[PDB]
Every structure is written in C-alpha cells, then in structure tokens.
Design a protein around this ligand. Structure first.
Ligand SMILES: C=C1CC[C@H](O)C/C1=C/C=C1\CCC[C@]2(C)[C@@H]([C@H](C)CCC(F)(F)C(C)(C)O)CC[C@@H]12
Length: 254
C-alpha cells in the first residue's frame, strides 16, 4: 500500500536550507569552547549543599548554553517561513523552545561510548556529574541521558535531525503565541517534508515508524523542559547565582 511521493523541488530546497543553516551554526570541532569561563570540577563524589555552595561547573555550562542559544537564534532565522512571523511570535517560540533545541543539538556530541557529551579533551567532556555541579538533580539528568540514548539509537540522517529541530522551534502550542494558525502552517510544511523524506530516503528497518518515534521525542522534550524550568527556578534562589549565568540565559529561563 504505502505510497512514496517524491520530494518536491520546494521540499528539497527546504532541506538544503536547513542543512546549510545547521552547518553555519553548529561547529562540530567545538573550537570556540576555550573562550567560555573555564570548567571547574570540585571534589563531589558524594552533595547538594556543596554543589550549591560552589556551583563550580555553572559559569562554563551557562556560557555553553548561552552560546548555543545564540546559535539557535541564528538557525531559527533561516527556517523557511520563520521570518514571516511577527517579531513577538518569533521571540515567544525561541524562548519556549531554547532548552529543547539545546538538548536536541547536543545529541551530536553525545556518545554512547561512555554516556558523555564529548567536545574535545577531558576538559570539555561533560558527564552527569558535571551537570550536578551546575546545580541540577537526577530528576532532570537521568531522563536527559535516557533521551540522548533513545535519540542516538534512531540513527537520524542529518536531514531528519535538522527538520526535527525546526519542527521543535515552530510549534503552535507554546504559551503566548498570537498567530497559531500561521505557525501551524509553517510547521506542517516542515512536518510534511520530514514524513516525505523518511518514506523516500530512509532505508528499512530503521524507517519503521520512524516519524512517530520522532514525534514522541518532541513530547519527551516538553517533559524535560518543564523539569529544567522547575530546577532552574530553584537554582536561581542561590545568592550570587546571577553572576554565574549570562544576561541571555537569565532572560530565556527567568
Ligand atoms: C549545548 C551543547 C551544544 C553543542 C555541543 O553538542 C555541546 C552541548 C552540550 C549539552 C549538554 C551537555 C552539558 C549539560 C547540558 C548543557 C544540559 C543542562 C541541563 C543545561 C543546564 C543550564 F541550562 F545550563 C542551566 C542554566 C544550568 O540550567 C542540557 C544540554 C547539556
């Protein structure tokens, strides 16, 4: 049964644009990371009290996330149709999706070799213990690692990866959007591109229900987003926390 319509010229153009956008905004050598405030790892083999007292990994990770938010803003601006949205809707979509797109894009550095995000030598290898040294708890971290492994195991083509990040950003069901119908039309154009790509271009057996597995990952991201936000709120009560973050991070997550 399953018909396999060919990608339209327009859909091929969308894919080309998104790939180019990603290649321009995601440096796979991590060569800027030496510009961030340095990673510091206090001895904490056991402690929430110590973690909050020092927040040793927070300046480095806040700089990494802040940099990544900048990159995602750039990426978003290149999504076909995004600039047709009002400025207010653009900003609502970016602020609401930022953490989720950071989680998706990080999958590229994530490695199942040792369940880390590996971005160079030891200094820029991030493990669960680094995230706890930035003031988060295992209610966020363990589902985050489970999410990274589940995504890695879909073995997405880069085309599918960039479409998934675009679909995440252009979501009509974010609080505070004004033109939900326009956002939905943009998202549907991207979703249709993805569905078509998978059916034409993704060999079996990895194509089996791949679209539905990808839409499930979007739902998973909502849950992580909510948990991150709850934890960020608590982290923000720590005196002097603001100096360890950045203005962009404070705005997006405040
Ligand atoms: C962000 C990327 C993209 C480029 C590389 O691929 C490396 C990479 C890794 C992303 C990583 C590895 C380090 C921990 C990160 C940043 C997670 C952490 C829960 C964010 C916490 C926070 F948001 F920083 C804060 C403010 C303390 O709340 C979310 C994504 C994770």
């Amino acid at each position: 049964d399953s018909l396999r319509p060919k990608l339209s010229e327009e859909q091929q153009r969308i894919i080309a644009i998104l790939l180019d956008a990603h290649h321009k905004t995601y440096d796979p050598t991590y060569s800027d990371f030496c510009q961030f405030r340095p990673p510091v790892r206090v001895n904490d083999g056991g402690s929430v009290t110590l973690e909050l007292s020092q927040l040793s990994m927070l300046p480095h990770l806040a700089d990494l996330v802040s940099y990544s938010i900048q990159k995602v803003i750039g990426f978003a601006k290149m999504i076909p149709g995004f600039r047709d949205l009002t400025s207010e809707d653009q900003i609502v979509l970016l602020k609401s999706s930022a953490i989720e797109v950071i989680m998706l894009r990080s999958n590229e550095s994530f490695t199942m070799d040792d369940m880390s995000w590996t971005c160079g030598n030891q200094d820029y290898k991030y493990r669960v213990s680094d995230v706890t040294k930035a003031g988060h708890s295992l209610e966020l971290i363990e589902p985050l690692i489970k999410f990274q492994v589940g995504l890695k195991k879909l073995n997405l083509h880069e085309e599918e990866h960039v479409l998934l990040m675009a679909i995440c950003i252009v979501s009509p069901d974010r609080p505070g959007v004004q033109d939900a119908a326009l956002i939905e039309a943009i998202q549907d154009r991207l979703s249709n591109t993805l569905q078509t790509y998978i059916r034409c271009r993704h060999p079996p057996p990895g194509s089996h229900l791949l679209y539905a597995k990808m839409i499930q990952k979007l739902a998973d991201l909502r849950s992580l987003n909510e948990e991150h936000s709850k934890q960020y709120r608590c982290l923000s009560f720590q005196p002097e926390c603001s100096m360890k973050l950045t203005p962009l991070v404070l705005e997006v997550f405040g």
